[PDB]
UniProtKB/Swiss-Prot annotation, chain A:
The chain holds residues 303 to 722 of 1434 of the full protein. GO terms for biological process: arginine catabolic process; calcium ion transport; cell redox homeostasis; cellular response to growth factor stimulus; establishment of localization in cell; multicellular organismal response to stress; myoblast fusion; negative regulation of blood pressure. The keyword Iron applies. Keywords: Calmodulin-binding, Cell membrane, Cell projection, FAD, Flavoprotein, FMN, Heme, Iron, Membrane, Metal-binding, NADP, Oxidoreductase, Phosphoprotein, Synapse, Ubl conjugation. This is Nitric oxide synthase 1. It comes from Homo sapiens. Isoform 1 is ubiquitously expressed: detected in skeletal muscle and brain, also in testis, lung and kidney, and at low levels in heart, adrenal gland and retina. Not detected in the platelets. Isoform 3 is expressed only in testis. Isoform 4 is detected in testis, skeletal muscle, lung, and kidney, at low levels in the brain, but not in the heart and adrenal gland. Ubiquitinated; mediated by STUB1/CHIP in the presence of Hsp70 and Hsp40 (in vitro). Signal peptide: none annotated. The lineage of its organism: Eukaryota, Metazoa, Chordata, Craniata, Vertebrata. It is found in: Cell membrane, Sarcolemma; Cell projection, Dendritic spine. Heme b binds at C113, Y404. The PDZ domain participates in protein-protein interaction, and is responsible for targeting nNos to synaptic membranes. Mediates interaction with VAC14. It comes from the Eukaryota.
Length: 415, 419
């Protein structure tokens, strides 16, 4: 249209979205069916010259508008300069300012991220000169060290060279920089994180010597210039971990639970002006429920509800005792208490969602909207006692963006 | 063209063709998703007031076709005569009348098609009370009382809908002004706070402004405000012996009962519009039984509702200085334990969000297997607490609009011209 309205049914606040008119890529929905809850709606899908020109123009135009230099001499020469590169080299190179701007705005545009109030405080590490897996390891270690900051976590991203022909991609094969291994046992059981069973097998196959324990930090599996990925052990002093204890339940520490302090997504693709940065690990800090609800309590994950409820002496014979709900809360209290006690940055789902509402309202004020994916923004527990549950949100895809990409081991041509 | 939904816990993939029969816009486009907009679309199947023939007949034909298709006629003698009967009726009244079988089919299928309803595994077990002979608010009150008594069934709740006369010209609407048949009053206090149910403050004020004598308590069952044939609405007190209530106590916290909380047993939505073959049934109160989280999470713990979280947390002796103590989450669980314990103790039908969502997954698989799909609104189906430890959270869903359907409609006091 030219205006869309979103209402908060708790506060009655109504905001007007004009920004959705600038959307240029599909949500997955059609006019007659909504695919809002679908999680994911060839490597040679590299953009041609003619495809790249308007994408580049759009981004450069966006960047020069953002800095109030639209139409300027430097805006027109940059456009001419980009077009020359696309003409001659079939691609182009972002200036450092553009790269920073692009990476920050991909975060700003990530409709599934509840932590976007921080988007403009992002530390961008330019790793576009990297050429080997050893180099990538170095950049990633410096990233982890900077981001962890002895527990006072700082959001950061490290951007490796962009895709060229799709045959020389840089990839972190890890889904996060720090995750725990998972081992399927012969008896069907799983040790460690079941989500990482296949990637653990890949590592072991590449030569990793697994400790075979419940909380083994995985090695990095790093791929530079489309070569076979190489294994690297993150220095253990760089991996900040928090042992999980409960403020009231003495026995909780006896579950032997711990988690890492630094959530660092490493398998997504950063798209800026048609350029595809296939390796761009970014990191922030945790919302407690990511660990306490999903990592610990998903049936497919560590799946500790039964253990915690047993220790809590809960009546587990029928679902209506809500024993799962009761143990879920205590687990999440323990995660928060533990990070806070160890002075490792964390945010609880109540603070995060309240902050996101403030962020959303500010984005509407200054930007004309804030794309938001309700299905992901609402925390995985206690949904409606958080303010975002009652917040209408419009979802739409702006670029620069973070995009999913196939797991590398499905498409990699081994040398 | 033919869409798959995956459950990320089980890796069960379902393949949806039923969406190809969807008629109305969701509100989304290829470029915007309105999945969390409460009312994303005003796309209606028929225009403002009484449709012309070329507007109403095609809708009628489509529903009659669907009904006779459903019973493995289609083109049968009775189907073709029905089309001519509907055709003649629209020619001579600008509307048409549903047979009892069509009405029952339509009501059950509007429920079957309600993408936001997690209870739909019961859809074909629906008692339909035909009230299309009703002419006055007194008659509506009589019909609603019978509905309430039948549906309540001394605590063994039974799904029911009562269907009053369809809209004719729009000036003669039958409306239940209550949003549910049984809700508690909300009172605006002189000191600015609110007593009772804040959602119902405005409707409570209409009732008082209509002559209702509020007892001014926290659990005052609202009177019925019934409108028949476009006339001014009339107040009626539901006989309290028909209004089953459950005192809320806790199986461990002996002090919980001293909070003086209760809730009613029967959720009976009464402000929605039932749409069948272009017919608009503007008064179609329907009821089932509660999912515990509707009372314990939304009714009791929404900020602009009863908001009893601090009260319960205080009794539980929780650290309420910061959020990260998760004191709201702890009290929230205890309230929902209490709600379930209270209803089950009093042998009043209720379902917890774990079993209700599990049944819905089973309903989805049934529907894909026999019907080629099942429209489902994830935003509404996932419960308001402990989302991801329920299976629906991990279930991709396709949302699309099938007819017959339940629709929202304006609150009649924004519309009604008094006399
Ligand atoms: C700084 C603190 C941050 C917090 C508390 C936070 C919180 C979250 C949470 C809870 C999720 C959902 C994760 C899940 O449920 O699996 C998420 C998703 C996401 N975050 Fe953030 N985040 C933060 C920082 C960042 C940063 C620094 C970036 C990028 C530079 C980022 C980009 C994203 C993206 C792209 C997604 C969703 C990916 C998708 O589309 O599925 N976030 N965030
Ligand atoms: C019998 C047990 C039933 C259960 C457990 C159940 C459960 C629910 C719940 C929890 C909701 C969401 C309500 C809210 O969050 O405010 C809902 C919505 C709904 N229910 Fe059911 N329900 C049942 C029966 C019925 C019946 C008998 C009908 C109609 C004949 C019906 C029609 C609907 C509709 C149309 C909606 C969505 C209304 C909208 O679009 O806003 N339900 N149901
Ligand atoms: C259970 N969390 C796993 C997970 C966590 C995060 C995430 C990312 C960042 C930067 C911060 C944070 N706090 N979380 C992002 C994703 C994904 F893949 F969706 F982007 C998944
Ligand atoms: C939070 N309760 C309010 C509410 C309850 C229900 C509802 C309806 C039925 C038949 C059963 C049930 N268990 N619930 C339906 C709605 C609405 F408006 F969406 F249709 C709202
Ligand atoms: C099927 C559904 O889309 C899927 O389970 C989603 C639900 N919402 C989510 N929300 C967040 N934050 N993270 C998730 O992984 C998911 N998974
Ligand atoms: C903004 C959002 O769509 C709105 O608050 C919805 C969210 N999901 C819901 N889900 C249910 N079951 N009931 C509701 O009232 C709502 N409210
Ligand atoms: Zn949509």
């Amino acid at each position: 249209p030219r205006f869309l309205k979103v209402k908060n049914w708790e506060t009655e606040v109504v905001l007007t979205d004009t920004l959705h008119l600038k959307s240029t890529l599909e949500t997955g929905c059609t006019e007659y069916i909504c695919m809002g809850s679908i999680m994911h709606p060839r490597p040679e899908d590299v953009a041609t010259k003619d495809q790249l020109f308007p994408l580049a123009k759009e981004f450069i135009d966006q960047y020069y508008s953002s800095i109030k230099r639209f139409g300027s001499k430097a805006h027109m020469e940059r456009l001419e300069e980009v077009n020359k590169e696309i003409d001659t080299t079939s691609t182009y190179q972002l200036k450092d300012t553009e790269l920073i701007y692009g990476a920050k705005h991909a975060w700003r545009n990530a409709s599934r991220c509840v932590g976007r109030i921080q988007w403009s405080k992002l530390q961008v590490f330019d790793a576009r000169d990297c050429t080997t897996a050893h180099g990538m390891f170095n950049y990633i270690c410096n990233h982890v060290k900077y981001a962890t900051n002895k527990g006072n976590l700082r959001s950061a991203i490290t951007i490796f060279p962009q895709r060229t022909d799709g045959k020389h991609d840089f990839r972190v094969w890890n889904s996060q920089l720090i995750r725990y291994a998972g081992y399927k046992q012969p008896d069907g059981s799983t040790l460690g994180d079941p989500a990482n069973v296949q990637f653990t097998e890949i590592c072991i196959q590449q030569g990793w010597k697994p400790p075979r324990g419940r909380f083994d930090v995985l090695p990095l599996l790093l791929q530079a210039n489309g070569n076979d990925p190489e294994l690297f052990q993150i220095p253990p002093e760089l991996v900040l971990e928090v042992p999980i204890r409960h403020p009231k339940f003495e026995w909780f520490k006896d579950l032997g639970l711990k988690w890492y302090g630094l959530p660092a997504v490493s398998n997504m693709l950063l798209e800026i002006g048609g350029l595809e940065f296939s390796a761009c690990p970014f990191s922030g800090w945790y919302m407690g429920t990511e660990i306490g609800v999903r990592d610990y309590c998903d049936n497919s994950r560590y799946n500790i509800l039964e253990e915690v409820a047993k220790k809590m002496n809960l009546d587990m014979r029928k679902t209506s005792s809500l024993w799962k709900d009761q143990a879920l809360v205590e687990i999440n209290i323990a995660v928060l208490y533990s990070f806070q006690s160890d002075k490792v940055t964390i945010v609880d789902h109540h603070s995060a969602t309240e902050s996101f509402i403030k962020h959303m309202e500010n984005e509407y004020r200054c930007r004309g909207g804030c794309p938001a994916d309700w299905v992901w923004i609402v925390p995985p527990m206690s949904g409606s006692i958080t303010p975002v549950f009652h917040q209408e949100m419009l979802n739409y895809r702006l670029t620069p963006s973070f995009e999913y990409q196939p797991d590398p081991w499905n498409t990699h041509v081994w040398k």
